[PDB]
């Protein structure tokens, strides 16, 4: 939050609602697998990279 205030002129910020998070994760969400932008179209890709963290599915 101290770093964000230095860059305030360049950015806009706010607390996101769960529906806003869902729409970003579903409609615009793309993974970073092997430094590639891989579209998140299934719960399998999330399981593959985040099963260690217990983030098996999109929910």
């Amino acid at each position: 939050l101290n770093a964000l205030r230095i860059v305030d002129h360049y950015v806009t910020y706010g607390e996101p609602t769960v529906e806003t998070i869902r729409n970003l994760i579903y409609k615009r969400g793309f993974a970073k697998v092997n430094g590639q932008r891989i579209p998140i179209v299934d719960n399998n890709l999330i399981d593959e990279q985040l099963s260690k963290h217990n983030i098996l599915c999109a929910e």
């Binding site: 769960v18 719960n43 399998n44 399981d47 098996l56 599915c57 999109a58 929910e59």
Partner: peptide, 21 residues
């Protein structure tokens, strides 16, 4: 087998998380 486990986790979590919200 793995696909079913993720689908099962999801059919449960989607409902658990909805109650939390």
């Amino acid at each position: 087998k793995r696909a079913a486990l993720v689908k099962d986790h999801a059919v449960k979590s989607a409902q658990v998380y909805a109650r939390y919200y």
